[PDB]
Every structure is written in structure tokens, then in C-alpha cells.
Amino acid sequence: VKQVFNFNAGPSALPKPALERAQKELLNFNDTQMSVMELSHRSQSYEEVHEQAQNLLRELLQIPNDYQILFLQGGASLQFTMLPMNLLTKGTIGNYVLTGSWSEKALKEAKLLGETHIAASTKANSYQSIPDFSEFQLNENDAYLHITSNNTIYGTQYQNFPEINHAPLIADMSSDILSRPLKVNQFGMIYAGAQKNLGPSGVTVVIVKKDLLNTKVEQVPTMLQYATHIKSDSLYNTPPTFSIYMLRNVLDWIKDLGGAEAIAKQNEEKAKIIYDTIDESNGFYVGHAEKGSRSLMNVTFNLRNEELNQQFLAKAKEQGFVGLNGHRSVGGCRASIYNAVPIDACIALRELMIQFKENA
Amino acid sequence: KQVFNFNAGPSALPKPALERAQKELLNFNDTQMSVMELSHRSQSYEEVHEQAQNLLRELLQIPNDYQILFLQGGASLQFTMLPMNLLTKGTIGNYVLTGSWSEKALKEAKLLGETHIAASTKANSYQSIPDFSEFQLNENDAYLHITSNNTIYGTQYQNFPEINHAPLIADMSSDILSRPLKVNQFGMIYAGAQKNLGPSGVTVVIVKKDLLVEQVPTMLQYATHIKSDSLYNTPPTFSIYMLRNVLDWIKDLGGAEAIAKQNEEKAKIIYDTIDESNGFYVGHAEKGSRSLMNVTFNLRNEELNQQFLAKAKEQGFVGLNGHRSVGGCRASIYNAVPIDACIALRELMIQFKENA
Ligand SMILES: *Cc1c(COP(=O)(O)O)cnc(C)c1O
Ligand SMILES: *Cc1c(COP(=O)(O)O)cnc(C)c1O
Ligand SMILES: [Cl-]
Ligand SMILES: [Cl-]
Ligand SMILES: [Cl-]
Ligand SMILES: [Cl-]
Ligand SMILES: [Mg+2]
Ligand SMILES: [Mg+2]
Ligand SMILES: [Mg+2]
Ligand SMILES: [Mg+2]
Numbered sequence: 001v002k003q004v005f006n007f008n009a010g011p012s013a014l015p016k017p018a019l020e021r022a023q024k025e026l027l028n029f030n031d032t033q034m035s036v037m038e039l040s041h042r043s044q045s046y047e048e049v050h051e052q053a054q055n056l057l058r059e060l061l062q063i064p065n066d067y068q069i070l071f072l073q074g075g076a077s078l079q080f081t082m083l084p085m086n087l088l089t090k091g092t093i094g095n096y097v098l099t100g101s102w103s104e105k106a107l108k109e110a111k112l113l114g115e116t117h118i119a120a121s122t123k124a125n126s127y128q129s130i131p132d133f134s135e136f137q138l139n140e141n142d143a144y145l146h147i148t149s150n151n152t153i154y155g156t157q158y159q160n161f162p163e164i165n166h167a168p169l170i171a172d173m174s175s176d177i178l179s180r181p182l183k184v185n186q187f188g189m190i191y192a193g194a195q196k197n198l199g200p201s202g203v204t205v206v207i208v209k210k211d212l213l214n215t216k217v218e219q220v221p222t223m224l225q226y227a228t229h230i231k232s233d234s235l236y237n238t239p240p241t242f243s244i245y246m247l248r249n250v251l252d253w254i255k256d257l258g259g260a261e262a263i264a265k266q267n268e269e270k271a272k273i274i275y276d277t278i279d280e281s282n283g284f285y286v287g288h289a290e291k292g293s294r295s296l297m298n299v300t301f302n303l304r305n306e307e308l309n310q311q312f313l314a315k316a317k318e319q320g321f322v323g324l325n326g327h328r329s330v331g332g333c334r335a336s337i338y339n340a341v342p343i344d345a346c347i348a349l350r351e352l353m354i355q356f357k358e359n360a
Numbered sequence: 361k362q363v364f365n366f367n368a369g370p371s372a373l374p375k376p377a378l379e380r381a382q383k384e385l386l387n388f389n390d391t392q393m394s395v396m397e398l399s400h401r402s403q404s405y406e407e408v409h410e411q412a413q414n415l416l417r418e419l420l421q422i423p424n425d426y427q428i429l430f431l432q433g434g435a436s437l438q439f440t441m442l443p444m445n446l447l448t449k450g451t452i453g454n455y456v457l458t459g460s461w462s463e464k465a466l467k468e469a470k471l472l473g474e475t476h477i478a479a480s481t482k483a484n485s486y487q488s489i490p491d492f493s494e495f496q497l498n499e500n501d502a503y504l505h506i507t508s509n510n511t512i513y514g515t516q517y518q519n520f521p522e523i524n525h526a527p528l529i530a531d532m533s534s535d536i537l538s539r540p541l542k543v544n545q546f547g548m549i550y551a552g553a554q555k556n557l558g559p560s561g562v563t564v565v566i567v568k569k570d571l572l573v574e575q576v577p578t579m580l581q582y583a584t585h586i587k588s589d590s591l592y593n594t595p596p597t598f599s600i601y602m603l604r605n606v607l608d609w610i611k612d613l614g615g616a617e618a619i620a621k622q623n624e625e626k627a628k629i630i631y632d633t634i635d636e637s638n639g640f641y642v643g644h645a646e647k648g649s650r651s652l653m654n655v656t657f658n659l660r661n662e663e664l665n666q667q668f669l670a671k672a673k674e675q676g677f678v679g680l681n682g683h684r685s686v687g688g689c690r691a692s693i694y695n696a697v698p699i700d701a702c703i704a705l706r707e708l709m710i711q712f713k714e715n716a
Contacts, residue, residue, distance in 0.1 A: 004392040008399045011597060016386075019394055023385040027378055032678075033363040035378055037559035037602070040367050040679060073432035073561065074579065077593035081577035109577055195594055200396045202432065202561045202596030221440035221468055223433060237436035238554055240561035241370060242598060246396070322391075323399055 005345040008323035009152065009336040011195040018249035036245045041238060049245050056251035060259055063184045063207060070206035071234040071244050076174045076193040079204060080109040083170060086217050086226050088114035092143035095119045100127045100151030101329060106172060119145060127154040129293040133162040142167040144188060150176035153327040155300030156293040161186050168212055176297045178254060179339055180264035188212045197338045199250040202243035263339050270337050270346040271296040277350045284357045302332040312356055319352060364701040367679035368692040370554040377605035395601045400594050412600050415607035419616055422543050422566060429565040430590040430600050435533045438550045438563060439468040442529060445572050445582050447473035451502035454478045459486045459510030460685060465531060478504060486513040488649040492521040501526040509535035512683040514656030515649040520545050527571055535653045538695055539620035547571045556695045558603035561596040619695055626693045627652040629702040633709050640713045658688035668712055675708055
């Protein structure tokens with residue numbers, strides 16, 4: 001039929017082969033004559049999937065053997081409270097770097113549970129940049145330092161990660177995990193809802209330094225202890241089996257295209273197509289982020305006034321573009337260009353942008 | 361290539377629901393995207409989300425003063441979320457123990473507050489549901505918690521107690537929407553979807569609105585989810601889509617009364633087989649408490665038990681091993697398990713007994 005270009009911000013485009021693979025075996029997985037959704041998570045067919053998803057992640061991000069990979073329910077949002085529940089102990093401080101709205105939501109949950117601090121923030125200038133690491137106010141009693149690697153709503157992204165030795169570095173990488181190579185040992189824990197760059201909603205990937213958190217925390221509900229899930233290999237209670245399966249399929253696809261290094265090359269190219277369009281528009285389109293902080297995953301911009309914003313977004317939607325409206329809290333536009341968004345979608349968006357500009 | 365899916369959780373689903381999912385997996389509702397590729401704030405997703413709630417409301421006849429929530433974390437997270445929200449200081453989380461899942465729920469409440477056992481059949485290894493006249497209730501109960509179907513032990517509430525001093529709360533994971541319900545008896549009902557309603561990944565919570573909060577994490581307040589219509593954060597969109605599909609199948613076959621007829625025939629096939637076996641097969645549950653959802657039984661000794669389960673597996677039956685905590689055999693016959701599978705089981709049971 002007509003064209004559809006999927007710029008949804010979360011859940012988002014999946015790579016076609018992962019969906020085609022799921023479709024073909026939806027009723028009969030691994031010759032069992034059952035859907036993967038109808039299997040016991042204690043079945044060997046399921047355990048294979050569960051283990052493969054872990055091994056693919058391990059290989060793709062080169063995760064060290066002293067880290068474990070958890071598959072949890074509850075979204076990144078549940079991790080906002082689970083993290084301080086496990087690590088924010090009395091006399092310690094949950095230290096946060098604020099670089100957007102998702103950083104503020106993380107902070108707020110820690111405030112419910114303990115002492116917090118703000119190491120650095122670009123909130124005053126509306127989160128157009130990542131603060132300089134030299135500006136980080138660190139405390140000797142910090143339980144951890146928490147960052148948001150990619151600020152989904154504001155379109156900014158860490159180019160690199162701070163060296164932190166006094167506390168574990170924790171990162172919400174929901175919207176850029178496995179979009180590029182990562183030195184995992186810079187961190188004590190990384191978490192990501194899968195629905196932005198790794199597959200479906202319903203599972204949250206948590207990569208954790210085992211010794212930071214494989215120990216029981218007194219007074220914490222069993223389901224809310226990392227230790228519980230580490231010990232049981234994310235099989236303490238029933239896992240989201242279809243979500244983990246789809247995650248596996250998506251990871252297989254990333255591996256098939258050459259891994260993190262190859263997908264970074266693709267992601268830089270798609271992003272360049274859109275930012276060059278903005279940058280050659282003589283101010284018709286204005287990116288929110290400062291150039292040194294531009295996200296490769298979420299491209300945020302405005303036209304010169306809200307009327308043009310609305311006409312542009314209405315024209316997009318009529319031409320088959322999905323998800324370009326900015327987050328409700330900030331307005332404007334947001335082109336989400338996660339791993340699986342195809343480059344011709346990006347070219348199509350550029351075409352749209354240029355004709356709208358020329359005809360305005 | 362004959363397979364009979366008696367898995368206990370996750371479990372068989374209706375073929376029409378899975379076929380419908382397969383057909384539109386790449387192109388949902390002519391959007392040219394998977395349901396999995398939609399924003400949860402899209403109208404496209406929002407209609408599915410609402411349709412799943414609407415179907416549950418219709419099928420269980422849920423009154424207007426109840427809200428239907430779709431949460432992550434399984435029934436296991438509800439074990440702690442419930443007392444987190446309702447077990448206020450100077451109140452008591454009161455539990456009726458009818459199996460190991462009851463025990464797991466009570467354990468989480470003990471972390472957070474005062475608990476109590478209203479009644480328990482544990483001493484007799486959970487062969488029955490206690491008499492309601494036996495319950496020990498307290499003026500300051502925050503709630504009375506029960507497990508409607510005791511998945512590991514194969515017993516089930518025939519009816520529910522009339523409780524007015526505190527909200528009645530029920531873990532219905534393994535029998536929700538297997539029969540009509542009087543939802544007004546309860547302040548809250550919860551269930552992982554993965555037994556009777558859908559795939560794993562979503563938990564259905566039916567809650568009396570005005571029943572349910574300083575200092576509880578945002579994600580763990582029922583009020584968060586009630587206020588946001590279970591769209592506070594990203595829901596498990598595909599699981600809710602599949603739940604809708606399963607609910608459409610139940611509606612299409614005639615609703616809660618119709619599925620109860622099927623379920624009672626399924627259970628009748630197995631229990632009759634056991635009762636007519638002259639002691640070769642022995643059911644764990646007392647007759648009066650027999651579950652329609654999980655049929656638990658053993659052969660006369662461990663070696664015959666093992667021989668039977670081996671023969672079963674060879675013949676294409678899946679999931680019949682009993683829970684590791686109790687051994688024996690367990691035939692889970694949730695909504696989507698077809699009558700033909702239970703007939704096959706019967707015939708295998710009869711042949712095995714003849715050939716022993
Ligand atoms: C989407 C998003 C979240 C929210 O994830 P949920 O799974 O909806 O809780 C949190 N952090 C970031 C950076 C996000 O982009
Ligand atoms: C399966 C089951 C549970 C566990 O559900 P999860 O989704 O695995 O947490 C809890 N209670 C009962 C009665 C069950 O049958
Ligand atoms: Cl943000
Ligand atoms: Cl977002
Ligand atoms: Cl039980
Ligand atoms: Cl069980
Ligand atoms: Mg491959
Ligand atoms: Mg193309
Ligand atoms: Mg219909
Ligand atoms: Mg008879």
C-alpha cells in the first residue's frame with residue numbers, strides 16, 4: 001500500500017527479519033508444535049532462548065564475566081526505584097547527573113528512599129547539552145553516580161562516559177543501548193527498557209556487576225532485590241518469555257549486520273542525513289541540542305513557530321510518517337532513529353523536510 | 361506430530377488467538393506496523409488496551425466502581441504490592457493458607473507489617489479448602505487474602521466467603537475467568553495472565569477503586585496506575601494485545617458460563633478416570649475441594665509414577681510432571697486446553713493401567 005515511515009519513540013520499529021522469523025514459527029517453535037508463548041520457562045526450548053539472548057548481549061557489548069545479565073519486568077521506570085532500594089543505604093547519597101526529564105524521574109524515586117545529590121545539571125538551559133565531567137560535584141558517601149546516557153525527550157547524548165572510582169557509575173541507557181560499542185567495565189550497572197532499541201516492551205535489560213549486588217538487602221521485598229534475580233538467573237518467577245524471545249531475535253539481527261561497531265556506522269549515517277537537513281535549512285528547522293551533544297537516536301527540532309510546527313507534523317502524518325510529534329512535555333518534533341529504523345526512512349524525512357521548507 | 365499441552369504456566373493458548381496474531385504480526389490494523397512497533401500513546405495501541413479492559417469487564421461483569429489494571433511483574437510482585445499499599449500501621453494482613461502460593465503471598469506481607477493466619481489446611485498437606493466458619497478474623501484486618509485455586513496442590517474454592525469487616529483479596533492466577541464470578545465479593549482480584557488469559561508478561565488486577573499513600577515508590581502505588589489507566593509507563597503492549605485476542609475467543613464461545621461448561625467436562629474426564637481406576641491413580645485433593653484447573657494425582661509408587669510420566673512424554677504430552685515440591689503428576693487444564701487433549705490423557709491413563 002502507501003508508504004509508512006516509523007519514527008516511533010518507544011516502542012519502536014523492529015528489524016523486519018526478527019518479525020518475519022517470529023511470524024513464521026509463531027504456532028510451532030523449535031518443532032515442539034507449541035508457540036514459544038505456550039512453553040514452560042523451565043522447558044529446554046525456552047531455556048535455550050533465554051541463554052542465547054544473554055550470550056548474544058555478552059558477545060555484542062563484550063560484557064565481562066563478572067557481570068550478569070538480568071531480564072526483568074517493570075520497565076526502566078521500575079529500575080528508578082529498585083536501584084536506590086538496593087544500593088541507597090543509610091548514610092549514603094544517590095548522586096544524579098541531570099540531562100533531561102528521564103534523569104529527573106530517576107532522581108525523584110531516589111528522593112523517596114534516601115539522601116540524594118545533583119552532581120551536575122543542564123536543566124537551567126533546558127537540557128541542550130551534556131555537562132562537562134569536570135563540573136561533577138562528587139561526594140565521598142555517594143552510593144552511586146547515576147546518569148542518563150541518551151536523553152530521549154531532549155535529543156542529547158553522552159559522547160563518552162566519566163571515569164568514576166569512588167562509587168559505582170549507573171546508567172539509564174534505555175534509548176541508546178547497543179547502538180554503539182560500550183566499555184561495560186566503566187559501570188556498576190546499566191539498565192534499559194528493551195522497547196526502544198532492543199525489541200519489544202515488557203522486558204528490561206539490566207547488566208550488573210555481580211558483586212555490587214548479589215547480596216541480600218534486609219527489608220527489601222523479594223521481587224525487588226537484585227540478588228533474587230541474580231541467584232535465579234531471572235527465572236525467580238515467570239519471565240516475559242515472548243519478549244525475551246523477540247529480544248533474542250533482535251540481537252541475532254544486530255549480530256548478523258556486524259555488531260555494535262557496524263550498527264554505529266549505520267546510526268551515524270542516518271543521523272547525519274537528518275542533521276545536515278536541519279543545518280542546511282537556514283534556521284527553518286532548529287535543533288534543540290547543542291551540536292557537541294546531538295543524539296544519534298532521537299533528533300529533536302522545532303520550526304520557527306507553533307503554527308508551522310503543526311502544519312509540518314500534519315503534513316508528515318498525511319505522507320505516512322509515524323511518531324514525529326515531540327514528547328508531550330516539550331512539543332516540537334522528534335525523529336526517533338533507533339537501530340532498526342531504515343536509512344530510506346531518513347532519506348524520506350529529509351525529502352519531506354526540504355519540500356515543506358521550499359513550499360512554505 | 362501429536363502434542364498435548366498440559367503446561368502449568370505459561371500454558372496453552374487458543375489456536376484462533378494465535379492464528380490471528382500470526383496473520384497480522386507484520387501489519388496490525390492496516391498500519392503496516394506490528395502491534396509491537398506501535399507507540400503506547402498511539403490511538404492504535406490505545407484502542408487495543410481499552411478493548412482488553414472492556415472484554416474483561418463484559419466477561420466477568422465487573423461493576424463500574426472497579427478498575428482494571430494491566431501491570432508488569434507477575435502475581436509475585438502483587439504479593440508485595442498489596443501489603444505495600446494496604447498494610448498500614450496497626451493493621452493486619454490476614455491470610456487463608458490453602459497451598460504453597462498462599463504461603464508465598466503471606467511471606468511478603470510479613471516483611472511489611474503484622475500478619476495473621478485466619479485458617480490453614482497446611483497440617484493436612486493442603487488437601488482441602490477450610491470451612492469459612494473456621495476463619496479467625498480481626499477488627500483491624502487490612503484485608504483477608506485467599507488463593508482461589510491452589511495450583512500446586514490441585515484444590516479450589518467452590519465459592520467465596522462473605523467478608524464485610526475488611527476487603528477480601530484473591531490470587532486467582534490459575535482460575536481467573538474459568539467460570540462466572542461475583543466480583544462484588546472482593547476488594548481486589550489479581551492474576552498473572554499466563555494461565556487462563558494470555559502469555560506471560562502482563563498481570564491483571566481488578567480493584568475496587570475507592571479502596572486503593574505516602575512514601576511508596578511511584579511505580580508500586582496502585583493509585584499511579586489507576587490514575588494513568590495502566591499507561592503511566594510503557595505497558596507490555598504485545599502481551600495485552602494477546603490478552604485481548606484470548607478474551608475475544610472466550611467471548612466468541614459464549615463467555616464465562618460457556619467456558620465453565622467446557623472446563624467442567626475436561627475435569628470430569630480426568631477425575632472420573634482417576635475414580636474409576638480402583639486405586640491405580642490417586643487424587644491428592646479431597647473430592648469436595650477438587651480443582652477444575654489443576655488435577656493432581658499419583659500412581660501407587662514412585663517408580664510407576666515415573667514410568668507413567670515417561671510414557672506420557674513419549675506420547676506427546678507436555679507438562680504433566682507434578683511440581684518439584686510435591687512430585688506426582690499434575691494435569692493443568694486451563695481454559696485453552698481442549699477437551700480432546702483430556703480425552704487423549706484419559707485414554708493413555710487407561711492403557712497404562714491395563715499394561716502395568
Ligand atoms: C522510555 C524511557 C524510560 C521509560 O521506560 P519504561 O519502560 O516506560 O519505564 C526511562 N528512561 C529512558 C531514557 C527512556 O527513554
Ligand atoms: C503461577 C502462580 C503465581 C506466580 O505467578 P508469576 O507471574 O510467576 O509471579 C502466583 N500465584 C498463583 C496461584 C499461581 O498459580
Ligand atoms: Cl530526557
Ligand atoms: Cl521518551
Ligand atoms: Cl498451591
Ligand atoms: Cl505452580
Ligand atoms: Mg546470525
Ligand atoms: Mg526500503
Ligand atoms: Mg468476536
Ligand atoms: Mg460417572
